[PDB]
Design a protein around this ligand. Structure first.
Ligand SMILES: OC[C@H]1O[C@@](CO)(O[C@H]2O[C@H](CO)[C@@H](O)[C@H](O)[C@H]2O)[C@@H](O[C@H]2O[C@H](CO)[C@@H](O)[C@H](O)[C@H]2O)[C@@H]1O
Ligand SMILES: OC[C@H]1O[C@@](CO)(O[C@H]2O[C@H](CO)[C@@H](O)[C@H](O)[C@H]2O)[C@@H](O[C@H]2O[C@H](CO)[C@@H](O)[C@H](O)[C@H]2O)[C@@H]1O
Lengths: 140, 140
């Protein structure tokens, strides 16, 4: 129901959660992707404080793009996403890192390189359909 | 106007041309992809006689997937696609190879590994919108 690429203005801080519900657009044999980027401005050319890219069935990479340039990639072969299935992805902002839950299971983390307060936009794109996108804030 | 992923039943032989008109869904800085697969069956899990994958602004790879397994990739750094622009892609079936034209300029070729008569379906997907898809036949 939600158009992909999906772009939403957003603010993040400790206690924020970004929740995404979606489905890959192809079987895992054909290697669909999912990408979630937390941007510093509304323009898609802007810096990316948190880049999260799934190659379904193979691996996840995370990185940041700072003053136009990609930094050191983190790779994970953890693959909790299931072939042909809807997924629910939860990205929580903790004081020290993002925690990424997939279908309720802690699956990835990524230490902050730029403060989350620098985020102004979230983009969700590549080979998925989307049925839910929510940013929720629970102050500690 | 045409939904992506786009799938169409198709038959190919010498003199067939597949013409695609579309636009990337993101600026080249964000590395959108385009993928065109000529399949041996309507199911997307089926073998791929010709796989054509553009990482816009970086490179093109071509390959085949035969009895479930990818063969030897061919890589080209030729990049005639222009950032932010609509493209027109022409794939022509010659006796010995596919010839790929981009905006009227010969840009890639790929020798036949499986006869084109094995194709039953064409899928166009990843990070593009599509305004035209045509399969046309001119017998020599
Ligand atoms: O500008 C995109 C270009 O940069 C490469 C490195 O050359 O990757 C960077 O950008 C990716 C997002 O598009 C990001 O996922 C990477 O973490 C970041 O380094 C290049 O990707 C190629 O190299 C990376 C490894 O650095 C591979 O993950 C990827 O498969 C390659 O295509 C991007 O095209
Ligand atoms: O099954 C997909 C898986 O296979 C890899 C090789 O491990 O690539 C094959 O499939 C690609 C289409 O998804 C096709 O483009 C390749 O030609 C084919 O070898 C893997 O891709 C990784 O390795 C290839 C190089 O072989 C890189 O082009 C790619 O960036 C890598 O992600 C696919 O995930």
């Amino acid at each position: 129901l939600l158009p992909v690429p999906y772009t939403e203005a957003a603010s993040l801080s400790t206690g924020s959660t970004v929740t995404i519900k979606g489905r890959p657009l192809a079987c895992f044999l054909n290697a669909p992707y999912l990408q979630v980027d937390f941007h510093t401005e509304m323009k898609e050319e802007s810096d990316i404080v948190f880049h999260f890219q799934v190659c379904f069935g193979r691996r996840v990479v995370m990185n940041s793009r700072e003053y136009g340039a990609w930094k050191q990639q983190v790779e994970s072969k953890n693959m909790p996403f299931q072939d042909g299935q809807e997924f629910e992805l939860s990205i929580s902002v903790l004081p020290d890192k993002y925690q990424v839950m997939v279908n309720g299971q802690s699956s990835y983390t990524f230490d902050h390189r730029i403060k989350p307060e620098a985020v102004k936009m979230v983009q969700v794109w590549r080979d998925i359909s989307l049925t839910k996108f929510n940013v929720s804030y629970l102050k500690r």
